[PDB]
Amino acid sequence: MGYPVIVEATRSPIGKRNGWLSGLHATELLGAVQKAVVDKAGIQSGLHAGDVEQVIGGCVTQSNNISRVAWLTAGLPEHVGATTVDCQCGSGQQANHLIAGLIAAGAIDVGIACGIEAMSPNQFEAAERIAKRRGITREDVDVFGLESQRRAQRAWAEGRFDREISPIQAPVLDEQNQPTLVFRDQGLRETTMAGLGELKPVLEGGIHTAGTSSQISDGAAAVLWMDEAVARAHGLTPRARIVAQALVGAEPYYHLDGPVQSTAKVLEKAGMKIGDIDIVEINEAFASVVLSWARVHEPDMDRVNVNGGAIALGHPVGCTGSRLITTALHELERTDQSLALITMCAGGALSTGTIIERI
Amino acid sequence: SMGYPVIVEATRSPIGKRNGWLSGLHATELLGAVQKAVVDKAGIQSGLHAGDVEQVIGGCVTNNISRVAWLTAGLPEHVGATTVDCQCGSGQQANHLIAGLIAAGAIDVGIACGIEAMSRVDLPNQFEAAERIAKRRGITREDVDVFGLESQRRAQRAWAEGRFDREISPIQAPVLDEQNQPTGERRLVFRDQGLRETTMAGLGELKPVLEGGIHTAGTSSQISDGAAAVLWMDEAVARAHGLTPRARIVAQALVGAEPYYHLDGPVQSTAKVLEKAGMKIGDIDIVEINEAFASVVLSWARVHEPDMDRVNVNGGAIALGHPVGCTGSRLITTALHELERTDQSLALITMCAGGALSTGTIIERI
Ligand SMILES: [Cl-]
Ligand SMILES: [Cl-]
Ligand SMILES: [Cl-]
Ligand SMILES: [Cl-]
Ligand SMILES: [Cl-]
């Protein structure tokens, strides 16, 4: 029945933890972005908030995990590792895949996918295993981390993010809450090859530092989707379509290398190859994830995370899917290119891949 | 650093009704009792202790921040809002993860477990999908009532014959009075609480849960209290501790389900796991397909055409209850023990997972 297209996509600026957005309750920050995505659509159209038929938000990131607490409650030995599958990576692209599918199914004509990150075993270890596995060094990740920072700085200098960002009003917070608008990503960082060479690895025997991994950050994003002809009837312009999608199980012991599989599978579904893709957005939680993915697929690295990624911009993990779709779409439009691949970790030990085409 | 994962022990607690026999236990007490029982069972005839376990992985557990946000920005109340989450539980994911970590050589001994419980302090989206799945395949009110009656009969027969005795770890729980207040007493609970005398006439009288629907309380399962756990080892490590390998995973598959038919995943996950194993449906001796809704099972059956005498032979969730968060471990545990009881070789386990995923697993008794 339906033909889903993206008509508007927006993100908040990304704030540091305890930074410029920290004075907002998670519900207020998400709410601002839900409203902004509707208001953008309404600027030269008939669309109103009550025309949204379904909103689907990604799961929220969360030891006190029930498996461990149970194990201790029964008197069992404390050295034993216990974890509970939850929302470690966020749901990645799931909300956007579900909204688009519900439109294709003819269940709804208008939907919003959204996500939020705020004040509402182990990741570095996995990222180090992924590095050793394919000979990724300390120097390799420092080069990549420097480049993400440079590209994000260049992107900001040239105003590349101006279209995609909804400015957000937030309280002063910090030391005094008595005092009663944020435009820019706060995580952008004034570092160099030498600076990065000085940093101490986060794990003994590791290659990643604070400069080649991202920190958890405050952010929200949302994507408004519509059936194509309903968009046209309301005077709104179709901007992108999903060409193919994939949701795959990652390797239990290399759980952050999922993008390798999800990229492979979504390309196969599309009948495409890496070189066909103009723009890639692959989440930069860890530099080794991207370099690992790149060593298998050997893309042109000048097309990968063109405006920087999470190492420079921050990692609002709960909205990653919408954040990456938002950034990819606006970079396709800015350069007038046709195809983007978006890939990332999801849930626990899953990865999603999505190919979109600008229209 | 390449292991060979095998199941060495699997146990499940009886399944209690909501506010029933296990409700006075905190989630952590109920899960903890089952984690400990799976270790104690393995330690009866071996050298194993709890401290030899290297990793425990439990499934995800279980108002929307999406809706609260939408409301706090002043937006319309009639708009539906949901959050992708742990609606179906993680199904088989914890068992797949423990086995994978052993195969990768990361650990030699691990426990997969799951819990469903509710602090003393299925939704309409689901029934809607289940009704879509029924109409799509011409499944009627009469069809699902026949299936629901049969689940109850099988469960009753299984209980009468003691079929569940080996698998179940009895659990000590607070006695609750008529008003759901504790008396101070604690009693060992042995039996699944959800079984009920059912007839075709009784079922025919029930009111559908949704306007125009075919499912009732008697052909859908209610959320229940339960936990289950499966102890996995590398086979050589099992032998070195004096334990016998009992089961192994032949093939496994995880599929993304249709967004608008999100409960029909078992059709695809079954197809794919059979293909990976080089098998057909008639090779499988025992199937465990989770009975959240009768239409899901009958839809699956219409595509794959199994012999239904091999399907949920000891009853399923319609009769036994639906402790969602431990479904994967519960079905693996029931399937393994029914292979051992009958001396048969292969079982297929299939169910919903996360939100709009489905898993299929083929296991062999060894
Ligand atoms: Cl999102
Ligand atoms: Cl509880
Ligand atoms: Cl009892
Ligand atoms: Cl489980
Ligand atoms: Cl299920």
Nearest to B89 by CA among B292, B244, B295: B292
The catalytic position among A59, A114, A319, A345 is A345
Q: Which is it for the CA torsion B68, B71, B73, B76, positive or negative?
A: positive
B92, burial (CB in 10 Å: exposed 0-12, middle 13-18, buried 19+): buried
Give the Cα-Cα-Cα angle B181, B184, B185 (nearest 5 degrees).
110
Contacts 24+ apart (CB under 8 A), A149-152: A149/A188, A149/A189, A149/A191, A149/A308, A149/A311, A149/A312, A150/A308, A151/A305, A151/A306, A151/A307, A151/A308, A151/A312, A152/A185, A152/A188, A152/A307, A152/A308, A152/A309, A152/A312, A152/A313
Q: Residue A20 CA to chain centroid, in angstroms?
A: 20
List all residues 6 or more positions away from A22 whose beta carbon is below 8 Å from its beta carbon. A15, A118, A119, A170, A173, A218
Verify whether the Cβ–Cβ distance A349 to B97 is below 8 Å. yes
- Assess contact for B214 and B208: CB atoms under 8 A: yes
Residue A67's alpha-carbon distances to A73, A75, B91, in angstroms, are 10, 13, 16
Task: Report how far residue A229's alpha carbon sits from residue A232's, in angstroms, rounded to the nearest whole number.
Answer: 5
Token pair of B174 as six digits: 């607070």
The catalytic position among B304, B322, B326, B337 is B322
- Which residues 250-269 of B have a C-beta within 8 angstroms of A? 254, 256, 258-260
Chain A positions touching B36 (Cβ under 8 A) are 74-76
Token pair of B78 as six digits: 């009639």
Give the single-character DSSP code of B263.
Answer: G
Residue A308's alpha-carbon distances to A317, A318, A327, in angstroms, are 16, 19, 10
Phi, psi of A61 (to 5 degrees): -65, 150
Out of B76, B82, B96, whose CB is closest to A49? Answer: B76
- How many C-beta neighbours within 10 Å does residue B53 have? 27
Q: CA-based diameter of chain B, in Å? A: 64
Token pair of B106 as six digits: 């990361």
Ligand nearest to the CA of A92: 1
Lookup result for tokens 């759980």: A255
Chain B positions touching A248 (Cβ under 8 A) are 254
Token pair of A355 as six digits: 């190919």
- Ramachandran region, residue A75 (left: φ > 0; alpha: ψ -120 to 50; beta: rest): left
Task: Report how far residue B345's alpha carbon sits from residue B335's, in angstroms, rounded to the nearest whole number.
Answer: 11
- Assess contact for A39 and A96: CB atoms under 8 A: no
A329 CA from centroid of ligand 1 (Å): 14
Distance from CA of A33 to the nearest CA of B (A): 9
List all residues 6 or more positions away from A207 whose beta carbon is below 8 Å from its beta carbon. A128, A131, A136, A137, A138, A140, A141, A201, A288
Token pair of B135 as six digits: 């109409």
| A91 annotated ligand binder | no
Out of A29, A66, A101, whose CB is closest to B28? Answer: A66
B331 CA from centroid of ligand 4 (Å): 9
Whether B124 and chain A come into contact, CB under 8 Å, resolves to no
- Which residues 79-118 of B have a C-beta within 8 angstroms of A? 79-86, 90, 93-94, 96-97, 100-101, 104, 106, 113, 115
Q: Which is it for the CA torsion B180, B182, B185, B187, positive or negative?
A: positive
Token pair of B128 as six digits: 């809607």
- Assess contact for B30 and B171: CB atoms under 8 A: yes
Q: Helix (H, G, I), strand (E, B), or coil: what is residue B185?
A: strand
Phi, psi of A310 (to 5 degrees): -60, -25
- Resolution given for this structure, in angstroms: 2.2
- Which residues 18-57 of B have a C-beta within 8 angstroms of A? 26-29, 31-33, 35-36, 39, 50-51, 53-57
Task: Report how far residue A249's alpha carbon sits from residue A352's, in angstroms, rounded to the nearest whole number.
Answer: 9
Give me the half-sphere count of Cα atoms (radius 13 Å) on the Cβ side of residue A193: 3
Task: Report how far residue A214's alpha carbon sits from residue A115's, in angstroms, rounded to the nearest whole number.
Answer: 18
Nearest to A116 by CA among A315, A314, A316: A316
Residue B112 forms beta bridges with which residues?
Answer: B57, B230
- Assess contact for B75 and A66: CB atoms under 8 A: no
Residue B118's alpha-carbon distances to A84, A85, B173, B226, B325, in angstroms, are 17, 18, 14, 10, 11
Ligand nearest to the CA of B357: 5
Per-residue 3-state assignment (H helix, E strand, C coil) for A153-221: HHHHHCCCCCCCECCECCCCCCCCCCCCCECCCCCCCCCCHHHHHHCCCCCCCCCCCCCCECCEEEEEE
Q: Helix (H, G, I), strand (E, B), or coil: what is residue B238?
A: helix
- Assess contact for B118 and B18: CB atoms under 8 A: yes
Give the single-character DSSP code of B64.
Answer: -
Lookup result for tokens 């079922």: B203
Out of B60, B101, B357, whose CB is closest to A84? Answer: B60
- How many C-beta neighbours within 10 Å does residue B283 have? 13
Give me the half-sphere count of Cα atoms (radius 13 Å) on the Cβ side of residue A48: 4
Lookup result for tokens 């994962």: B5
List all residues 6 or more positions away from B343 whose beta carbon is below 8 Å from its beta carbon. none
Token pair of B236 as six digits: 């050589």
Distance from CA of A3 to the nearest CA of B (A): 14
B103 CA from centroid of ligand 5 (Å): 27
List all residues 6 or more positions away from A98 whose beta carbon is below 8 Å from its beta carbon. A56, A113, B84, B259, B355, B356
Out of B36, B58, B82, whose CB is closest to A66? Answer: B58
A205, burial (CB in 10 Å: exposed 0-12, middle 13-18, buried 19+): exposed
Lookup result for tokens 């890496």: A274
- Assess contact for A76 and B32: CB atoms under 8 A: yes
DSSP characters over A283-352: --SBHHHHHHHHHHH---GGGBSBTB-HHHH-B-GGGHHHHHHHHHHHHHHHHT--EEEEEEEETTTEEE
Per-residue 3-state assignment (H helix, E strand, C coil) for B12-31: ECCCEECCCCCCCCCHHHHH
- Assess contact for B272 and B255: CB atoms under 8 A: yes
Task: Report how far residue A71's alpha carbon sits from residue A69's, in angstroms, rounded to the nearest whole number.
Answer: 5
Verify whether the Cβ–Cβ distance A253 to B106 is below 8 Å. yes
User: DSSP E strands: which ranges in A39-160?
Assistant: 54-57, 81-84, 110-117
Lookup result for tokens 């009732």: B216
List all residues 6 or more positions away from A285 whose beta carbon is below 8 Å from its beta carbon. A89, A123, A127, A213, A214, A256, A310, A315, A317, A345
Token pair of A260 as six digits: 């390798």
